[PDB]
Amino acid sequence: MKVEIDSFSGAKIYPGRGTLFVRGDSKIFRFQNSKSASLFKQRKNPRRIAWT
Amino acid sequence: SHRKYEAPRHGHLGFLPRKRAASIRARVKAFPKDDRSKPVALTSFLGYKAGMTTIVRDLDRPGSKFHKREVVEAVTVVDTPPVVVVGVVGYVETPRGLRSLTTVWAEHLSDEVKRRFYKNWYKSKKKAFTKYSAKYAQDGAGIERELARIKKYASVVRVLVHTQIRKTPLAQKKAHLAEIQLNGGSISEKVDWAREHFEKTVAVDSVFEQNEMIDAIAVTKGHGFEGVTHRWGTKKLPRKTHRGLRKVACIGAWHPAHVMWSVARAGQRGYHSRTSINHKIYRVGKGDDEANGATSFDRTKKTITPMGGFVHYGEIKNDFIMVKGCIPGNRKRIVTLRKSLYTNTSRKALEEVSLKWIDTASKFGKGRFQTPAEKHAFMGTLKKDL
Amino acid sequence: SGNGAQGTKFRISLGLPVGAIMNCADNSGARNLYIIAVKGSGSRLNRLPAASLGDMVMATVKKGKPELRKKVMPAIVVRQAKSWRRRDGVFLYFEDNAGVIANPKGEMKGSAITGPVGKECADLWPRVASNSGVVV
RNA sequence: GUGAACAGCCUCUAGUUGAUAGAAUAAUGUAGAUAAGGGAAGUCGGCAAAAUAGAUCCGUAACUUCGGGAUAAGGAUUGGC
RNA sequence: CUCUUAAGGUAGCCAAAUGCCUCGUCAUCUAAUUAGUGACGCGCAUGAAUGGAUUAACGAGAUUCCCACUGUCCCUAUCUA
RNA sequence: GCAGUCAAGCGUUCAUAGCGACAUUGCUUUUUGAUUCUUCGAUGUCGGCUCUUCCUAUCAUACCGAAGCAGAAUUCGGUAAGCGUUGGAUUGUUCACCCACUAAUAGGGAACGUGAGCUGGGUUUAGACCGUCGUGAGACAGGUUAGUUUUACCCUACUGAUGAAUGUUACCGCAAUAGUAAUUGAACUUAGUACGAGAGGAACAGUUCAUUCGGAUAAUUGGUUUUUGCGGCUGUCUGAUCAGGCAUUGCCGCGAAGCUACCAUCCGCUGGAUUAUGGCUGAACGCCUCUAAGUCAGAAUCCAUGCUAGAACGCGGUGAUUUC
């Protein structure tokens, strides 16, 4: 098991928790949870969001 | 007519009658086949489930693409505080079924169990096992003899056993109780093991062991009066159905001139009792041990207890168990474990699993931190800290 | 799947049934494929065939060159767009439903592929994994 | 008052507060709703529903009784200070 | 050539809301079509104010295909009153 | 429609591997007829949807035999209904055709199952068009178009629930009985082996996965939101602000808990008796023979194990059994 960071939010992602998203530019993103993922689908700014 | 498209039935008929249970607790309709070769030990145990959590390990299945690779799995906790023995009893054969002839009982009994016999305890004299007690206070007289009365007879022996519930978080204040069959040899010895074990506490660590397969026997959840769609997974009917669609249509033909037992119909869904076999153990629980939650590889003083606690259940201060999977029964329910009936090879009942990591994250949310410490380190100080 | 599967497959949430359309990640000359069947599929009353990554199907070309169009041909998924689970525990989903073309036995009739693909179809059908520059 | 507007929504004067009520919250229902991936494969049949929806600006087909088609299509924009 | 007509269906039109045999023959749209469209015509039994051929616009009219849309379906779930 | 018989012939040769003429015996009621017995003081009229059950004359799945069967694949046959038997275009369709997946894509009954269970597409009223016939109202298993689908609260049956009486009451518990369920395929090895001239090309064991079904759970993923929990936006009222009200839950973003999903996860047994069949010994019949006596092994079979209710008139064991 390896521990990661949220491609949106900046959190440790423990195994089989959260999700992953992929993008046809081969790029990978990780999400702890549906919140961050939904912001992502909303194509949002994790630098204007506060709690990141 | 020759039903046009010939498909599966819905349902299992061999779980009927789908009804509520006689009891919340699940009796053991059979026990393992004994060999008169062994030491004495039980064939079962009882415990209170508390929830699930998640487990990380490394697979050794030589041919799986995940061989020697990490995986995750889903397990549950079963609070196994040390069972008590209170009395045994004896059974013997007949032409017409095994049959009891004595129930011997200890001298001193916990108040937390004799409440089982009562329904309005708070206004009683408690007056129980008392004229029996005075059978003791003589050397063994009326008592040992029955044990001998059993040894004379009684192919099959069992043990009346109960819990020190009060340690559990719950406020049931009424222990449960049950039988267990014994599976050493030498019934004359079995009873003697027991006669020693009267009022003597027992822990499962003696009995079960890690990487062992078992069965589980318990009473599934309750949901209640349900419809023919869910209770049986029948179809939902289309949009333009008069008088509801969450139905079954043709419960039967003209002739036969009745309704068959084989038809999806409404009725209770849950509080049944079920038999869940072959769920491996991955770890034993030690109430008198911090780092129950640890592994070889993780190594923090973490227990199994999650941050903010289990849902509806709470702490795991007692001993405990970890078993692979999702077992029948819900939080706070008494669960009758049981050793298997037989010898499963399977190339999976034989794997010495080692644990890598155990998730303690809160389940009252979408948990991040295993722990306040970790949590504190990451976020840092707050307006609460000084 | 079938004749060409370089081994086998741990299940993944089927998310590309019939009537469906999925892009083409190769350079064969088609922009879409029309998923209509699956190999070795289930068999059930008014359930539809479902199809997943690594699976081999039959499809048809709507948009592209006429030598391709208006006929059936085998295809192979490489991207699902539906969140499946890997026994590492994780849930991952591409952003596209994407497949390619082949003969029955696993020869890409094209010459290369774009974008990501999944280790499943990769290790299950080799040639793909050759012409892939990317995998996850 | 918003708004184009006696549209809908809210409010003042004036009038009402009336339809058997209470605790519960299972099925089946009625009426409204929401749903991943897919997208009519259901289907007799896209019935229901969902989407589009205003205003400004641009762009605008074949056919045509040359009057229309035409909100054509199809695209953008819209806040607050 | 010939029988016959009071006259012998002209021009136009179609498997058409009229074409039994008919799921007519060909081509198309489809992966695939008794459908839909186009065309052919010995047309059981088309056809000229019994109105023929066509026709812009209009149509809660019928019929087909495509895009978008969506719990119609896969495949079923949940909440509400 | 289905099955047999005798064997002219075909099959290189060969009647009977597989086939079968000329004739012939029968069977089923799933076609359609035939009859008119019931029902015209009314049994809801085709088809589809859903749901269950049942049969066998078996497509597949098990086990075996036969082959003109080397292997391979195929074919004829046998016990077996246990288990399975699909997605779709067009047609109102039944039926049929086509496509495609398939291990396989078998036939059928149940008041031509099934309308107080749907639908109402066709048929089969009334309106309307056309064509042919008819002087005409009008007709046409000729076409087309639109056209109200009622009632259960009763009895039973099915499901689930409760329940008086057996000295009371409580706890543990046996099991008559009844039901039952798991099924199917692929990949790797074997094995490019066996076999075969070669082309080609296997099998059991064994491992990993999956299909269909079932039963449980809901850690995580996803879904759902009246937690009206949080925050956001409009419109309007509260003098302002603050905090808020209505907007048939105002709308939006999140959204814990709960529920839930092959959209998620886990699990799904081992022994016996046997069929077919092949066999041991061995008679009749001084030989032989799987059989008569006897006997062996052996199937997806049967019964058990196991799993599920617990007989409300089946039961044991056991604790305690009121005083003014």
DSSP bridge partners of B321: B284
* Per-residue b or e along B48-81, where b marks 16 or more CB atoms closer than 10 Å to that residue's CB: bbbbbbbbbbbbeeeeebeeeebbbbebbbbbbb
Output the CA torsion sign for B183, B188, B194, B196. negative
DSSP conformational letter for C49 = P
- The span from the first CA to the last CA of chain B, in angstroms, equals 81
Lookup: tokens for C73: 């041909």
In sign, the C-alpha dihedral spanning B289, B338, B271, B245 is positive
Tell me phi and psi for residue B151, to 5 degrees: -55, -30
- Chain B (40-59) residues lying within 8 Å, Cβ to Cβ, of chain A: 54, 56
Phi and psi, residue C128, nearest 5°: -50, -55
Asked if B379 has any chain A CB less than 8 Å from its own CB, the reply is no
User: By the 8 A CB rule, do B218 and B273 touch?
Assistant: yes
Largest CA distance in chain A: 32
C36 touches strand E (CB under 7 A): yes
State whether the beta carbon of C62 lies below 7 angstroms from any atom of strand E: yes
DSSP assigned state of B310: -
Q: What is the distance between the alpha carbons of residues B147 and B103, in angstroms, rounded to a whole number?
A: 10
Q: Say which of B5, B54, B72 has its CB closest to residue C88.
A: B72
Contact A6, A13 (CB under 8 A): yes
Expressed in Å, this structure's resolution amounts to 4.0
Beta bridge mates, B219? B273
* Sequence letter at residue B136: Y
At B73, phi and psi to the nearest 5? -155, 175
- Who contacts A28 (Cβ-Cβ below 8 Å, separation ≥6)? A7, A20, A21, A22, C136
Residue A28 tokens read as 């990978």
Among candidates C10, C45, C87 on the partner chain, residue whose Cβ is nearest the Cβ of B7: C45
Q: How far is CA B268 from CA B233, B335, B366, in A?
A: 14, 21, 33
Per DSSP, what are the bridge partners of residue C72?
A: C60
**A11 CB near a chain B CB, below 8 Å?**
yes
Give contacts of C87 with chain B, Cβ < 8 Å: 66, 71-72
Interface test mutation site (partner A, options C92, C96, C114, max chain A beta carbons within 10 A): C92
* DSSP β-bridge partners for residue B90: B102, B157
Q: Is C95 within 8 Å of A20 when comparing Cβ atoms?
A: no
CA distance B322 to B345: 21
From A34, A3, A12, select the one nearest A21 (Cα to Cα).
A34
Q: Are the C-beta atoms of A21 and A12 separated by less than 8 Å?
A: no
Taking contacts as CB-CB distances below 8 angstroms, the residues of chain B near A9 are none
Q: Which chains touch B (3 or more CB pairs under 8 A)?
A: A, C
Name the residue of chain A whose CA is nearest to B298's CA: A1
Residues B71 and C89: beta-carbon distance below 8 Å: yes
**Rounded to whole angstroms, how far apart are CA atoms C88 and C81?**
19
**Distance separating alpha carbons of residues C1 and C39, to the nearest angstrom:** 6
Token readout for A24 is 């046809």
3-state secondary structure of C73: strand
Q: For residue A32, give the nearest of C89, B357, B366 by alpha carbon.
A: B366
3-state secondary structure of B165: helix
The structure tokens listed for B106 are 């200890």
In whole angstroms, give the CA distance from residue B217 to residue B338.
7
> The tokens 């050493």 sit on which residue?
B184
Q: Could you give all domains of chain B from N- to C-terminal order, each with its CATH number?
A: 16-81+203-220+270-384 (2.40.30.10), 82-202 (3.30.1430.10)
Q: What is the DSSP letter of B15?
A: G
Distance CA C105, CA C9 (A): 17
Residue in this structure with the two tokens 């690779």, named with its chain if needed:
B69
C90 at A interface, C-beta within 8 A: yes
- Residue B33: C-alpha distances to residues B42, B151, B278, B338 (Å): 12, 20, 17, 12
CA distance B176 to B194: 19
Taking the mean position of all CA atoms in its chain, how far away is CA B178?
Answer: 12
Measure the CA–CA gap between B163 and B170, rounded to whole angstroms: 13
B129 CB-to-strand F distance under 7 Å: yes
C-alpha to C-alpha distance for B111 and B119, rounded to whole angstroms: 14
B78 and B47 Cβ atoms separated by less than 8 Å: yes
Work out if B324's Cβ lies within 7 angstroms of strand F: yes
- In order of their start, the domains of chain C are 15-136 (2.40.150.20)
CB atoms within 10 A of CB C97: 21
Q: Look at residues C109, C120, C117, C110 and name the one whose alpha carbon lies nearest to residue C133.
A: C117
Instruction: Give the long-range contacts of residues B341-349, CB within 8 A, separation 24 or more.
Output: B341/B30, B341/B32, B341/B33, B341/B215, B342/B33, B344/B213, B344/B278, B346/B278, B347/B61, B348/B61, B348/B280, B349/B213, B349/B278, B349/B280
Q: Are strands B222-226 and B267-270 parallel, antiparallel or unpaired?
A: antiparallel
Pairs of residues, one from chain B and one from chain C, whose beta carbons lie less than 8 Å apart: 18
Residues C55, C12: contact at Cβ < 8 Å?
A: no
> Among residues B344, B339, B21, which one has the least CA distance to residue B180?
B339
DSSP string, B178-238: E--BB-SS-HHHHHHHHHHHTT-EE-GGGT--TT--EEEEEE--EEEEE-TTTTT--PPP-
Closest-CA residue in chain B for A13? B368
Give me the half-sphere count of Cα atoms (radius 13 Å) on the Cβ side of residue B368.
18
B373 Cβ neighbours under 8 A, 6+ residues apart:
none
Secondary element (H or E) of residue C85: strand C84-85
Nucleotide nearest B237, from its CA to each C1': F50
Q: Which helix (H) or strand (E) holds C76?
A: strand C72-79
Q: Which residues of B touch C88 (CB under 8 A)?
A: 69-72
Q: Are A26 and C116 in contact (CB under 8 A)?
A: yes
Nearest to B25 by CA among B328, B332, B338, B333: B333
Return the DSSP state at B55: E
Asked if B86 and B163 count as a contact pair (C-beta separation under 8 A), the reply is no
How many angstroms separate the CA atoms of B290 and B306, rounded?
A: 13
Residue of B303, B345, B351, B368 whose CA lies nearest to B57: B351
Which whole-number Å values give the CA distances from B235 to B244, B248, C39, C114, in the listed order?
13, 8, 26, 42
Structure token pair of residue B313: 């259940």
CA atoms within 13 A on the CB side of B177: 18
Q: From the Cβ of C46, is strand E under 7 Å away?
A: yes
Rounded, the Å distance between the CA of B22 and C1' of F162 is 13
C27 CB-contact burial (10 Å; exposed 0-12 / middle 13-18 / buried 19+): middle
Q: Which nucleotides of D are covered by protein (CB under 7 A)?
A: 26-30, 36-42, 45, 47-48
B360 vs B308: CA distance, rounded Å = 10
Minimum-distance CB partner of B368 among A15, A32, A34 = A32
Nearest-by-Cβ selection for A16 from C89, C95, C116: C89
Q: What is the distance between the alpha carbons of residues B8 and B68, in angstroms, rounded to a whole number? A: 39
Nucleotides of F under 7 A from a protein CB: 48-53, 83-88, 95, 99-114, 116-120, 150, 157-162, 170-176, 179-181, 185-188, 207-223, 253-271, 305-310, 314, 316-321
| Interchain pair C88, B7: CB under 8 A | no
**Residue B15 is which amino acid?**
F
Interatomic CA distance for residues C96 and C32, integer angstroms: 12
Q: Does A44 touch chain B (CB under 8 A)?
A: no
Could you tell me if residue C126 is left (phi over 0), alpha (psi between -120 and 50 degrees) or otherwise beta? alpha
Contact B65 C89 (CB under 8 A): no
CA dihedral A22, A25, A28, A34 (to 10 degrees): -40
Cβ of residue C45 closer than 8 Å to a chain B Cβ: yes
Within 10 Å of residue A44's Cβ, how many Cβ atoms?
Answer: 13
DSSP-derived 3-state class of residue B300: coil
Nearest to C88 among B5, B8, B71 (CB): B71
DSSP E strand stretches across chain B:
44-58, 70-79, 83-92, 99-104, 156-162, 177-178, 201-202, 214-219, 222-226, 267-270, 273-277, 281-284, 321-324, 334-339, 355-358
Element (H, E) at A31: strand A27-31
Rounded Cα distance between B70 and B94, Å, is 54
For C92-122, the DSSP string reads EE-SS-EEEEB-TTS-BSSS-B-S---HHHH
Measured between CA atoms, how close is B366 to chain A, in angstroms?
Answer: 7
Cα distance between residue C73 and residue B293, in whole Å: 54
Residue showing tokens 């970890």: B322
The reply to whether residue C89 touches residue B72, judged by beta carbons under 8 angstroms, is: yes
| Separation between Cα atoms, residue A48 and residue A32, nearest integer Å | 19
C11 touches chain B (CB under 8 A): no
Determine contact, residues C74/C55, Cβ cutoff 8 Å: no
Contact state of B54 with A12 under an 8 Å Cβ cutoff: no
**Tokens describing residue B334:** 């008494």
Comparing every residue's Cα with the C1' atom of nucleotide F108, the nearest one is B2
Positive or negative, the CA dihedral A28, A32, A33, A35 is negative
Name chain A's partners: 3 or more CB pairs within 8 A. B, C
Distances (CA, A) of B24 to B73, B221, B381: 29, 10, 48
